[PDB]
Amino acid sequence: ITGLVYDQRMMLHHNMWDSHHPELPQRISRIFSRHEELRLLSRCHRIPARLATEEELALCHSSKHISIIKSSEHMKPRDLNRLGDEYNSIFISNESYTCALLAAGSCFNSAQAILTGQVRNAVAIVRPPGHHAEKDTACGFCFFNTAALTARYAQSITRESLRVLIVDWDVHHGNGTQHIFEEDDSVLYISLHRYEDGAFFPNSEDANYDKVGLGKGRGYNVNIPWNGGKMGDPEYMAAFHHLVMPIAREFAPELVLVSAGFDAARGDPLGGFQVTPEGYAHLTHQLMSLAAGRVLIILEGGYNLTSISESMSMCTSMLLGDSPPSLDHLTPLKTSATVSINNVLRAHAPFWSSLR
């Protein structure tokens, strides 16, 4: 029923100059170990990992960007150090390119397994993350945009115009995913992210609510930016009820990809929010009502090892069919959260009749 892909070879990507960098190899092994402790692994169908090909990376990335990252596979440490400093917040090791290939190819196999009907949904415990990677550059711990590539891969084996919904609940804006699909009406990108008027990473006004897409893509980019607050379950539930789910139902996606960063969880040193594991489980179960249940959960950020292990395991439990948790929908929101939601409603009401 539920697929799961994990490969410890993705642990080889590491930071040679700061072993305490929070994007640790143990991120994925701790999540995998938690699935075993909770006896969820044996309930899933193990999907094998594989390398994405260079032709598949070219679905979203330029040949120059593919070539440069590929060239790092055999660089000396001094060259890996210099190459990394040419990007915003990037460390590179000799294994980084292969791990990025394995992360993308693992989601390709997961999407294919969903599209053949072999599994109903799937989880991908992969690293390095992807949603900060742009067409021509790496950024924010990301080399290739795994979620964006998986969307294009799905279209390449079913129908070119297959309607794919990408929900990005990582605490950071997926600037790479937004730009790749900004003019595309076949891929709806909805991102919830801490914004702080543009001061939170990645420090760009591209993440604001008035960025709704370009050309034919107008209305197919939904930014839900949080400002001046410590958001948690009530704010994310309200955004799904008023924004994500009404838009997603009207879009009627045929496939749902979740850029699932868990750095908005309580205790995360980079996020500062307090979304609980039950909150992530509620969001997952909501998305399962779409696309006849065809949901692929792809790991992005998340850096409290205990928090991400519990949170993603709760999402897998939901995909396996376990009963969703009960949450108080009457809890009052932070006042700035209501302002954020109303700003998004005003910006997207001219494009979605479900908001009018």
Active-site annotation, residues:
132
Are the CB atoms for 351 and 190 separated by under 8 Å?
Answer: no
The residues of the shown chain that bind Zn ion, judged by CB under 5 A, are: 170, 172, 261, 263, 301
- Asked whether position 300 contacts K ion by CB under 5 A, the answer is no
| Shortest Cβ 323–ligand HBG spacing (Å) | 30
Residue whose CB is less far from K ion, 181 or 303: 181
- Is 233 labeled as ligand-binding? no
- Asked whether position 89 contacts ligand HBG by CB under 6 A, the answer is yes
Give the one entry of K ion, Zn ion, ligand HBG, none that residue 201 binds, where binding means its C-beta sits below a cut-off of 5 to 8 angstroms depending on kind. Answer: ligand HBG
Cα 153 off chain centre by: 16
Pick one of 153, 201, 209, 236: the residue that binds ligand HBG (CB under 6 A): 201
Return d(Cα 142, Cα 300) in angstroms, integer.
9
- Is 210 labeled as ligand-binding? no
x-or-dash pattern for ligand HBG, window 100-139, by CB under 6 A?
-----------------------------x--x-------
- Asked whether position 172 contacts ligand HBG by CB under 6 A, the answer is yes
What is the signed CA dihedral for 13, 19, 23, 27, rounded to 10 degrees?
80
Give the one entry of K ion, ligand HBG, Zn ion, none that residue 220 binds, where binding means its C-beta sits below a cut-off of 5 to 8 angstroms depending on kind. Answer: K ion
Pick one of 222, 231, 264, 270: the residue that binds ligand HBG (CB under 6 A): 270
Return d(Cα 92, Cα 144) in angstroms, integer.
13
| Shortest Cβ 111–ligand HBG spacing (Å) | 22
Give the one entry of Zn ion, ligand HBG, K ion, none that residue 132 binds, where binding means its C-beta sits below a cut-off of 5 to 8 angstroms depending on kind. Answer: ligand HBG
| Shortest Cβ 162–K ion spacing (Å) | 13
Q: How far is CA 311 from CA 229, 263, 279, 291, in A?
A: 22, 10, 9, 23
CA atoms within 13 A on the CB side of 356: 8
| Shortest Cβ 249–ligand HBG spacing (Å) | 28
User: How is residue 335 written in tokens?
Assistant: 């006042």
Give the one entry of Zn ion, K ion, ligand HBG, none that residue 21 binds, where binding means its C-beta sits below a cut-off of 5 to 8 angstroms depending on kind. Answer: ligand HBG
Pick one of 182, 254, 263, 310: the residue that binds ligand HBG (CB under 6 A): 263
For residues 218-237, which are near K ion according to CB under 5 A?
220-221
Are the CB atoms for 3 and 121 separated by under 8 Å?
Answer: yes
Residue whose CB is less far from ligand HBG, 129 or 277: 129
Give the one entry of ligand HBG, Zn ion, K ion, none that residue 140 binds, where binding means its C-beta sits below a cut-off of 5 to 8 angstroms depending on kind. Answer: ligand HBG
- Is 172 labeled as ligand-binding? yes
Neighbours of 211 (CB within 10 A): 19
Cis-peptide, bond into residue 128, ω within 30° of zero? yes
Residue whose CB is less far from Zn ion, 130 or 301: 301
The residues binding ligand HBG (CB under 6 A) are: 21-22, 89, 129, 132, 140-141, 170, 172, 201, 203, 261, 263, 270, 300-301
The residues binding K ion (CB under 5 A) are: 168, 170, 181, 184, 189, 191, 193, 217, 220-221
Binding-site residue set for Zn(2+): 170, 172, 263
